[PDB]
Amino acid sequence: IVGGTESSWGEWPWQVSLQVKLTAQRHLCGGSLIGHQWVLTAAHCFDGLPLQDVWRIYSGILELSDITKDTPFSQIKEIIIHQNYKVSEGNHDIALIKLQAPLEYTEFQKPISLPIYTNCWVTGWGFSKEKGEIQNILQKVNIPLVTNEECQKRYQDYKITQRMVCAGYKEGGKDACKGDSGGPLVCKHNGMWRLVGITSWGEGCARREQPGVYTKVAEYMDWILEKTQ
Numbered sequence: 731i732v733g734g735t736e737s738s739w740g741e742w743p744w745q746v747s748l749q750v751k752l753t754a755q756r757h758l759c760g761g762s763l764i765g766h767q768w769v770l771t772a773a774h775c776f777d778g779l780p781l782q783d784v785w786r787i788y789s790g791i792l793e794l795s796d797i798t799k800d801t802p803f804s805q806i807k808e809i810i811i812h813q814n815y816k817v818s819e820g821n822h823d824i825a826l827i828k829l830q831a832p833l834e835y836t837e838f839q840k841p842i843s844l845p846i847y848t849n850c851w852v853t854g855w856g857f858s859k860e861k862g863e864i865q866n867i868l869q870k871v872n873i874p875l876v877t878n879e880e881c882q883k884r885y886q887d888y889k890i891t892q893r894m895v896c897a898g899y900k901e902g903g904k905d906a907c908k909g910d911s912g913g914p915l916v917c918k919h920n921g922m923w924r925l926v927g928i929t930s931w932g933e934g935c936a937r938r939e940q941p942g943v944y945t946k947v948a949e950y951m952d953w954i955l956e957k958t959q
């Protein structure tokens with residue numbers, strides 16, 4: 731997150747860290763807890779995939795530095811990458827993770843509701859600048875959506891589809907960045923947070939007139955419901 735501030739304990743209880751344990755353990759992506767056994771993330775977060783075991787999913791956490799062996803984590807039972815996801819294109823950037831064991835809901839660990847907006851927040855432990863590093867304390871930033879027309883105007887080299895939503899400022903300075911991928915874009919509807927986007931990509935981070943591009947969750951609701959039951 732570029733241009734954001736430190737989150738507080740319990741503030742974003744659906745935010746998870748998707749980490750890989752090889753020799754060292756590292757955070758690769760965010761995700762959003764959407765049910766007791768279900769995490770929603772970006773398909774591109776699995777572009778290294780075939781490496782067997784080695785995924786640990788952390789929920790109810792604020793600070794990556796306070797992860798020890800004592801820190802509980804979830805394990806992956808199943809990954810469902812959208813059928814139309816292609817590594818070479820940037821389309822359909824969405825995946826579900828079935829956890830091996832259900833997580834309980836608490837004030838620290840609970841799901842974002844699923845189903846045009848200024849009051850939107852992007853969160854994660856990604857870079858706070860393009861030549862950046864993974865952040866310790868979960869960052870938050872308030873960013874308005876832009877129309878698809880406006881976003882497409884900014885990205886002549888790419889196809890911005892009806893299944894994408896964009897968020898950014900004309901003069902940049904606030905954006906998601908590398909390592910935020912797969913985490914939430916939430917917006918306030920009628921006193922309640924809804925998952926509007928999944929952090930996907932952009933031309934760098936926080937550049938003027940280069941907004942963040944998100945997977946538009948509303949356009950995948952049939953696929954999310956079908957795959958989860």
Ligand SMILES: N#Cc1cccc([C@@H](NCC2CC2)c2ccc(F)c(NC(=O)c3cc(C(F)(F)F)nn3-c3cccc(CN)c3)c2)c1
Nearest residue numbers: 774819820860888905906907908930931932933934935942
């Ligand atoms: N349609 C389409 C399409 C076609 C080809 C490539 C891409 C896209 N990569 C594959 C998509 C996700 C599956 C793409 C295109 C152009 C780009 F410049 C990038 N780059 C990034 O994204 C990117 C680079 C960096 C960093 F600077 F840190 F290295 N961070 N980031 C990033 C990471 C997260 C958020 C955002 C939103 N500021 C940015 C990514 C998209």
